[PDB]
Each structure stands twice: as C-alpha cells, then as structure tokens.
C-alpha cells in the first residue's frame, strides 16, 4: 500500500514571557512516533510509539540536535516575520512548518512536501517538482529569493527523494505490526427519536485503521446527501479511529434507508439496514 511520513512544527511567540513555545511531532501515515515540546522537562526528542525505541542513542542524540535546530530557526523566523510585516513586539504570532514524503505501493518515492504558514495563512511552499517555490505576498518573495540563492530546494529534493523515503521504509519495517496493518471498522446503527413523525438514523464505524473511510446513506437505492450529517473522523485514543454518518428519516420508513461503509480493511463495501 501507499505510505507517508510527515513532520509538523508549531512555534508560538509569547513576548515578555520567555522563548516561543515550540512543538514538533512526527507521523508515519496516521500514527505518531515522535515529539519534542520546548516546555517539556526532557528537552529531548521523545518516542511516541514503542517501535521507534528500536533506534539507538545515536538516533536520539542526532534527532534531538536537529529538532532543537528547527526550534532555533523558528525562533528567529518569528522575529524576521514580525519585521517583514511591521508588527508590534508585544503581540503573539504563529509560525507553522510541515514537510515529508510519500511512497507508492512499491514503496518508491511518490511526492514530497515542504511548506510554511504565518499566523494560519500559507506563507511559502515547495512546488511538486521540488525545484520551485510558491510565495504569496512581498515578504514571502523575500524568503523565496534567499532560498533560491541558498539552494534550499536542491537540499530538500535530495532529502525528500533520498533520506526521507529511505527512513520511511525503515520505519514501516521496524513497526510493521502497527504500521502495515488494516483494522476493518466495527459497525452498528443507532436510532434516535426526534419526534412522533421522524427519527435520526446513525451509522457508526469504530476501531478502524487507517483513518481513510467513506460512509454514505441511500434510500430505496437513491443516494442521500445534504440530508445526511457527517462528523470529522476522530481518534479513539488507542491507535484506532471512529466516524459516524446520520440522516433524519420519517417514522415507519427507517428500513428504506441503508448505510454504506467503504474501507481499506473491508474485502468489500458494507451495507447496514436498520432493525
């Protein structure tokens, strides 16, 4: 199957109250494996998945040094950005960064990513060809120019198509029991009386992995929509995910509706009918 590795970085300035709050987290597909929190006692990159603990001291010392370097750069970025936008030295601002790679079913490089956001808005992003940048405003243009001269894209391309993919494969193997698995959803339907004229039918999908899933309602065959409510897929806390889809139906007509579940772990789509 296809897999991905992603690192997410968030740095928030808190002027007058010490250094910015920096949080870094690493993911392989839908499971987190490492984190770094500037406010944590350790001040070390820390494991968030037992399988990453198979990496030795050199890994942890090396990743700790590199994550602190990322923290340091973002600390400077916050200063640079407020300067770029002529903002007050007393306000709180946020810089976010994400980068990573995807591999196809062959586990060979598929695509790479490297982008930034300032105060919740796109700032600059590496394009798909991994050779050009996408800058929004004037400020981002300044950054772009600097990165082009510093050959940042060239170094990222080498990483994304090389080290990134190679280590992703290493992780996939070292944590195969959890990463290369598929947990089919456990499904059931609930009924909720809303009035003596109608009721809410809710289709649940629980304990599934990966997070990708499709839940849809149909009536006597036709596809229901706009009448169906969906919630964002959410974490159960045990490494698995949940999701539900609902539809308001007229009392006595419940059995006319059907829920359809599509998931990687299901040999074939599921169909649930109430009662």
């Amino acid at each position: 199957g296809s897999h991905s590795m992603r690192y997410f970085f968030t740095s928030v300035s808190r002027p007058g109250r010490g250094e910015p709050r920096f949080i870094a987290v690493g993911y392989v597909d839908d499971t987190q494996f490492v984190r770094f929190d500037s406010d944590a006692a350790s001040q070390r990159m820390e494991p968030r998945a037992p399988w990453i603990e198979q990496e030795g001291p050199e890994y942890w010392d090396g990743e700790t040094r590199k994550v602190k370097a990322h923290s340091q750069t973002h600390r400077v970025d916050l200063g640079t950005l407020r300067g770029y936008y002529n903002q007050s030295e007393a306000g709180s601002h946020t810089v976010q960064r994400m980068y990573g790679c995807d591999v196809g079913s062959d586990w060979r490089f598929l695509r790479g990513y490297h982008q930034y956001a300032y105060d919740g808005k796109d700032y600059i992003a590496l394009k798909e060809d991994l050779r050009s940048w996408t800058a929004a405003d004037m400020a981002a243009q300044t950054t772009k120019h600097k990165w082009e001269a510093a050959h940042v894209a060239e170094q990222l391309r080498a990483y994304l198509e090389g080290t990134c993919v190679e280590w992703l494969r290493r992780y996939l193997e070292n944590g195969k029991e959890t990463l290369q698995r598929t947990d089919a959803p456990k499904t059931h339907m609930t009924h909720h009386a809303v009035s003596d004229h109608e009721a809410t039918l809710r289709c649940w999908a629980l304990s599934f992995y990966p997070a990708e899933i499709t839940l849809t309602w149909q009536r006597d065959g036709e596809d229901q929509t706009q009448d169906t409510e969906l919630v964002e897929t959410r974490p159960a806390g045990d490494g698995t995910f949940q999701k539900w889809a609902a539809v308001v139906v007229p009392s006595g007509q419940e059995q006319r509706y059907t829920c359809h579940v599509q998931h990687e772990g299901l040999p074939k789509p599921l169909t649930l009918r109430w009662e």
Binding site: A69, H70, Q72, T73, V152, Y159
Partner: peptide
C-alpha cells in the same frame, strides 16, 4: 528522520 539543513525565512 529529520531534515538536517537549517533553513531561515
């Protein structure tokens, strides 16, 4: 594994 080249905006 993390990218090892420090980058500044």
């Amino acid at each position: 594994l993390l990218f090892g080249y420090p980058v500044y905006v």
